[PDB]
Amino acid sequence: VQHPLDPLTKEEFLAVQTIVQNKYPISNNRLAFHYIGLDDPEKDHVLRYETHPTLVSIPRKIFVVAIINSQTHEILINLRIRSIVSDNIHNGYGFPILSVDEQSLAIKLPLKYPPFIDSVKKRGLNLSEIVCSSFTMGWFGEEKNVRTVRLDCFMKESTVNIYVRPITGITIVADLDLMKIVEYHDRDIEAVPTAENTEYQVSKQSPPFGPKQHSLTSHQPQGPGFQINGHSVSWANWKFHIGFDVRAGIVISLASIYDLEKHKSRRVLYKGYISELFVPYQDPTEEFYFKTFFDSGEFGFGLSTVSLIPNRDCPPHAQFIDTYVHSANGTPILLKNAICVFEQYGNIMWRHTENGIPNESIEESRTEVNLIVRTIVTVGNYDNVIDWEFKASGSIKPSIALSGILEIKGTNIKHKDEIKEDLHGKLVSANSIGIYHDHFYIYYLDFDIDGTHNSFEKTSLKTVRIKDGSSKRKSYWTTETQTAKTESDAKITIGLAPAELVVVNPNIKTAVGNEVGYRLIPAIPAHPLLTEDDYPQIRGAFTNYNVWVTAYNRTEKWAGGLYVDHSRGDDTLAVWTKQNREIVNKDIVMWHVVGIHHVPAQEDFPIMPLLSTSFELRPTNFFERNPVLKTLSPRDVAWPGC
Amino acid sequence: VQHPLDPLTKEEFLAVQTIVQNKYPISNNRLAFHYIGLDDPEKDHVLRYETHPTLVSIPRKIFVVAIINSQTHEILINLRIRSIVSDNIHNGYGFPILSVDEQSLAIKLPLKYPPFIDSVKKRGLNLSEIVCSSFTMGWFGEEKNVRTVRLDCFMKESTVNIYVRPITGITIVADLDLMKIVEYHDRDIEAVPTAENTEYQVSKQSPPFGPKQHSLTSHQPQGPGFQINGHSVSWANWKFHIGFDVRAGIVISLASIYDLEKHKSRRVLYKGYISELFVPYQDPTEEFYFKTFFDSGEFGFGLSTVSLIPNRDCPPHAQFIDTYVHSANGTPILLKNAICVFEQYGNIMWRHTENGIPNESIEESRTEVNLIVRTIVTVGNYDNVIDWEFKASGSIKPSIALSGILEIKGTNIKHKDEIKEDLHGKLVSANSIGIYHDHFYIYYLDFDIDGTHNSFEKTSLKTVRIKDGSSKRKSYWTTETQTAKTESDAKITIGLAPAELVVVNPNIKTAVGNEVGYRLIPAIPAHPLLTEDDYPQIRGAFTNYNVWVTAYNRTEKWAGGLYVDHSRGDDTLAVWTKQNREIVNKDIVMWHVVGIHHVPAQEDFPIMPLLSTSFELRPTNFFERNPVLKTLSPRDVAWPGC
Numbered sequence A, B: 001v002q003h004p005l006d007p008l009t010k011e012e013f014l015a016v017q018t019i020v021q022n023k024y025p026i027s028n029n030r031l032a033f034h035y036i037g038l039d040d041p042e043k044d045h046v047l048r049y050e051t052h053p054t055l056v057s058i059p060r061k062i063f064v065v066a067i068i069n070s071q072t073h074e075i076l077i078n079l080r081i082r083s084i085v086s087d088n089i090h091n092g093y094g095f096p097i098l099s100v101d102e103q104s105l106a107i108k109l110p111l112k113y114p115p116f117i118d119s120v121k122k123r124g125l126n127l128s129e130i131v132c133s134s135f136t137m138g139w140f141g142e143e144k145n146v147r148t149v150r151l152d153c154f155m156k157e158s159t160v161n162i163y164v165r166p167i168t169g170i171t172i173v174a175d176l177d178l179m180k181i182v183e184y185h186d187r188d189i190e191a192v193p194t195a196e197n198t199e200y201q202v203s204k205q206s207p208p209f210g211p212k213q214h215s216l217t218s219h220q221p222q223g224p225g226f227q228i229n230g231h232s233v234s235w236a237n238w239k240f241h242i243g244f245d246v247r248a249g250i251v252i253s254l255a256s257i258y259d260l261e262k263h264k265s266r267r268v269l270y271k272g273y274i275s276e277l278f279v280p281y282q283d284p285t286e287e288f289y290f291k292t293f294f295d296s297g298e299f300g301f302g303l304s305t306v307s308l309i310p311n312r313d314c315p316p317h318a319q320f321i322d323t324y325v326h327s328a329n330g331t332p333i334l335l336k337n338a339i340c341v342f343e344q345y346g347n348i349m350w351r352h353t354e355n356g357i358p359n360e361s362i363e364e365s366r367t368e369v370n371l372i373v374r375t376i377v378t379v380g381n382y383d384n385v386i387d388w389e390f391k392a393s394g395s396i397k398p399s400i401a402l403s404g405i406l407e408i409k410g411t412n413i414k415h416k417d418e419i420k421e422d423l424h425g426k427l428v429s430a431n432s433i434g435i436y437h438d439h440f441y442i443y444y445l446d447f448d449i450d451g452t453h454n455s456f457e458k459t460s461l462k463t464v465r466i467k468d469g470s471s472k473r474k475s476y477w478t479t480e481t482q483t484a485k486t487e488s489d490a491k492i493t494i495g496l497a498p499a500e501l502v503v504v505n506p507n508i509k510t511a512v513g514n515e516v517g518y519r520l521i522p523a524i525p526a527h528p529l530l531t532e533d534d535y536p537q538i539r540g541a542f543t544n545y546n547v548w549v550t551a552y553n554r555t556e557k558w559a560g561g562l563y564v565d566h567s568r569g570d571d572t573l574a575v576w577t578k579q580n581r582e583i584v585n586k587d588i589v590m591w592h593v594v595g596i597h598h599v600p601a602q603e604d605f606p607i608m609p610l611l612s613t614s615f616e617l618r619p620t621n622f623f624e625r626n627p628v629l630k631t632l633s634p635r636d637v638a639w640p641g642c
Ligand SMILES: *[C@H]1O[C@H](CO)[C@@H](O[C@H]2O[C@H](CO)[C@@H](O)[C@H](O)[C@H]2NC(C)=O)[C@H](O)[C@H]1NC(C)=O
Pocket: A126, A127, A128, A129
């Protein structure tokens, strides 16, 4: 690797396979790799390195989670000396990220199980057109610690849209270690939604089509403004490293901006990535009570990353980056076009029309070029378009867009007239209930505002009522700034009262004496609607605040715990913060939870129009004055012609 | 005029001048036109004309507000017969929108005023480099009912950035009807902030510049996809009318969408515009207690609209519409490029990657072309970028962006160290305080969902606790929809608890029986921080709820009242709704309040990076299924070459 933070290469995937198979020969052992990823270097070594590469050496260390002969091992490898340096058995609750391989075996089980075959026949369904899927099942109080999953089955006849043609009414529990159906109950017969009008491939659709969209062509006469050197980006006044992890997906690191005025590169973000998802359904019945996915932890965001379709998921001028993931046997898989980088045009950067000076016409309007780093993660029926936008103004804008297919619950109801009771969802088509659920993302934000010693300030806006008749005004508002002293102070529920949430470096001030800082401008907040004692809410307890600030700790990385499938909520962000560390003028980290409550509607069927969300990380007294005061608009070059 | 709702043409302004001048000769009368606009045709006649243009005749009627020999007349002209049909004197509180002309004379007053010339010289300032501005003063309980304003002056020597070089500490009140300084107090001597680093014109700046931004060139092989016929726009599956008022600025009307599936054009929005603004400052001192602008009512949004800079305010492919405003004497003034329309590219419309079918690889990504209708209004130091975004998916997204210059208060303080009391703002530069304040906008949205008979439903999300052990889950959430019966029912504070807010046509159902509806997806809400009894708050009481729904009334149009300068808050949306009319299944209108609490930062100075805000009006069971299921991505055509 060019850089200590670079994603694992093919070659590295292979060395790891070899080294492990050397201690666990496959003829003598059952061996499966559930996670192979970088073991995080120590921050100071990375900080030292960056200033002196040619004279700083960091050994590449890999952390492997493998199930070997039914036991979860944690193995640390030092590829500098090609050797296992640690090998331990995980004895607490929870198992690793499922593998793709195991799920592909598991979904065939029902097709050969005799009782299922009877069930299908009883229903008159063609067995040759059934596709099944594995769903995690989490934990519900029981003492048993086994790798079970529920398998759901769907008809595929004339449509590839299988999630909208569920076979509902049957419980199927499979053990992934035995690879065996261990539980079965045909509970209910429900109609299977028709296949009519569920197709989304243009190749399978017929006229009419519309409305017509006018085409376009474009060109950057000087080519892109970013330079990618290995996994290092150079663009406008920014430099940052693009990373990739099979659990986390995209990882952004080392983001710094050059201050033209101070003539200095200044640190903003050491590292940021989504650390966990949580998609809880709201059907308490046997059909769905257990469906509350933890996508990064149970399925892997990196493993679920798809290949971007050029010109569609990214605009025609985008640059793409391929990564490598691994199979259950540790083989390197190439994921082409996993990440794209592109420049976005046409936004006003700032402007002013001055009409207030007699006999004078002054006007100024300038535009900006922004940088989008995009990746897409599809976990089953769910597509997640993940964007990191960088602006020359110093602003960072992480967003998320949702597309894909509703999880349908089949029913004999064809009209809202017939509903007698709470279906736990909406009728979006004859025989189809779009079940209510939430989508929660938790971002990990290791800000190092101009260095690592930082503090978290909450500035409240408060109304002041003038009592002494010393003004014609009866009231005004003002600000009050409190510094969070401990983790318990930095647990913020957004919406309680107006406040600005700022991360400052208390040790560095502007010429006028203001602390340098960056503020979080959040989207309208979503809050959890499950009770705090419900099992999934305990396991997903990191969603209990919109914002959390913690002392940095190299091992606190996964908000729902290192082992999430079948977890008991014993290792979440909620639990770590009970230590209540000091967070004043230290290396600190911010966590922001973004969420959406989803009430399905007919327009979401059979595939869903993008729904988007976004927050902004805005420089707040970081710069002496407007940082783009001296930035010129891109020029306008006229079209060449035919 | 091609259409009943078109803006007034040049010729119409002239006929109005002539007609008023025949009854009030300017040889004998002091005549000033404060407002000349369209008197709203009746909806029924407009709806009927729509279906039989060629067989329906609507007379152009004009509403004039004129100050004549100091009395305010409300004149209604019928241009069909060319005559005044009504002429009444307004005897209540409040006055018309100020005119440009009167402000230009008021600002010269301090320069000939002995007490002021002395103030200037005591401060050592050069009187030939002073510029002044008129600020409205509202009303604070007093009995007087006069047209007074405060005057504030600024140094302009080496910079055109006058708002950041205030001469602070002097009260100056002028009466606009007598045109003279009626009150004066030199209360305080404060340093005038330096001119160094305040300039924003590239023509006045010097190196260095950066970072460099790479150019672009672009092209639409088949030209734009919108057809603008008069003020009528045809684009993709949309049809709508672009209007313009000297008070309201842009008006969107008659927005219908073609439903390819139903083979029918369906009505969404009869009319929408911003009805009023409210920019309250938070300095209770004499210097500032009265500055709480009502920009549309006091200054005129159309009268403050600037000419758009091509390729800067609008991208190179944009089309421009010119309008006409009027001077104080009624003369038509041409406003070039007051409005631009352009297509936006590169967004994903919807997508799915299917990895769940064994041995099958399915993936679909389609992109959307969106329509942006933009106009910019600058009221003083403020710039407001106002966009109406339409999508083929049926979503409308109105957005507002802010840029322009901070209102500075001068101070002798150069460092935060020196601060010893609340300065009611933040030190953003030596000697310069950016005062706290808010920005509130109130949209008028006359939704006619597939027609006029509509209801308003509030769907709240309820947590349900399982007690009876009938499930492994301890809880889930569900929905409870209530129809608002009366206006008191439709006053909404967003943030108290989750709910979807939808406007439906309870008379038209989808095939599965859902009521067609559009829902409002709001930005994070700001709430008022002034007491409800404070004067500006009473006058601006329409910001007391984030959402209001009212029975349609052709005369309820301006949320802060017909007359806003010096108003006493007796004719605002808050008062009208005291009628508490019924809103179940009738012609209703929604009012949506959008706000920002501005805590200034040094990056806002000397000019401010755009700060944007947005909301979405999303189809909700309006369509049978995803309305863009059969829409194709635009063709990517390759660049020809140099
Ligand atoms: C459903 O199962 C099979 C598989 O889909 C059906 O047959 C496929 O078989 C032929 C050979 O490949 C194709 O050319 C046919 O077009 C296709 N047939 C169908 C049904 O789609 C089979 O006939 C069906 N079985 C039942 C019980 O109807």
